[PDB]
């Protein structure tokens, strides 16, 4: 039942810095993207047009493959800061 708390930010400017969600070891990219979208109230939109990037730093960003297991794909030794944006 492994999982981690990650911070997801939106590429917009609406007053929110980030919103935390849970990433279980069963979570594939489509699952986390829909979870992030809902959390940020993007229920109308489709997870297809969305991309998930891990912010390692201001110069480094890890692109999470569309069908990858986020729990195992993300850099666990880095910041659990992610950005949800349109592909």
């Amino acid at each position: 039942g492994d999982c981690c708390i990650i911070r997801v930010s939106l590429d917009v400017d609406n007053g929110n810095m980030y919103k935390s969600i849970l990433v279980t070891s069963q979570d594939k990219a489509p699952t986390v993207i829909r979870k992030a979208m809902d959390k940020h109230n993007l229920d109308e939109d489709e997870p297809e047009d969305y991309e998930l990037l891990q912010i390692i730093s201001e110069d480094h960003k890890l692109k999470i493959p569309e069908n990858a297991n986020v729990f195992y794909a993300m850099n666990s030794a880095a910041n659990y800061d992610f950005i949800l944006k349109k592909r």
Binding site: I5, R7, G15, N16, Y18, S20, L22, D38, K39, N41
Partner: protein
């Protein structure tokens, strides 16, 4: 432009997120969505002076209680929220207060007791017992409604002024 780090605390479902979102994004949508930890920021004018408001919207669920120590240490002011139709949340608010004082180790932490959901007729917590509790705590008591936006600005701005008075 001075920055203020506000923290919204209280039992689950009392309206912490609703309150925060009402202030920051000026809207209310009835939705079930338990918080782990969300962060907001908005520049706003309070008493003829622009300042930066950092708002940490915390989890009411006991599942994420281990995070309390960390945010209580960094937080400068706390909005202690409870719902007027939830007696248990009113009782829980005592625990938050004592925990904040314990972690920060101070007898004068900027706080504001908030009685949310004052729009609901089914009141189970009288304003009198809440005011007396706030009086004993020596902090202000403000009844709010994240739905109608009643007292929302007052609650957050009063906490800001409280922090300013302390700092």
């Amino acid at each position: 432009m001075t920055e203020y780090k506000l923290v919204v605390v209280g039992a689950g479902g009392v309206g912490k997120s609703a309150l925060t979102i009402q202030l920051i994004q000026n809207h209310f949508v009835d939705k079930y969505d338990p918080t782990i930890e969300d962060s907001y920021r908005k520049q706003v004018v309070i008493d003829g002076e622009t300042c930066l408001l950092d708002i940490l919207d915390t989890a009411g669920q006991e599942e994420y209680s281990a995070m309390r120590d960390q945010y209580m240490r960094t937080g400068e002011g706390f909005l202690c929220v409870f719902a007027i139709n939830n007696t248990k949340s009113f009782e829980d608010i005592h625990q938050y207060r004592e925990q904040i004082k314990r972690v920060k180790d101070s007898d004068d932490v900027p706080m504001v007791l908030v009685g949310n959901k004052c729009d609901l007729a089914a009141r189970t917590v009288e304003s009198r017992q809440a005011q007396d509790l706030a009086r004993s705590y020596g902090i202000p008591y403000i009844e709010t409604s994240a739905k109608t936006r009643q007292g929302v600005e007052d609650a957050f701005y009063t906490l800001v002024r409280e922090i300013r008075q302390h700092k």
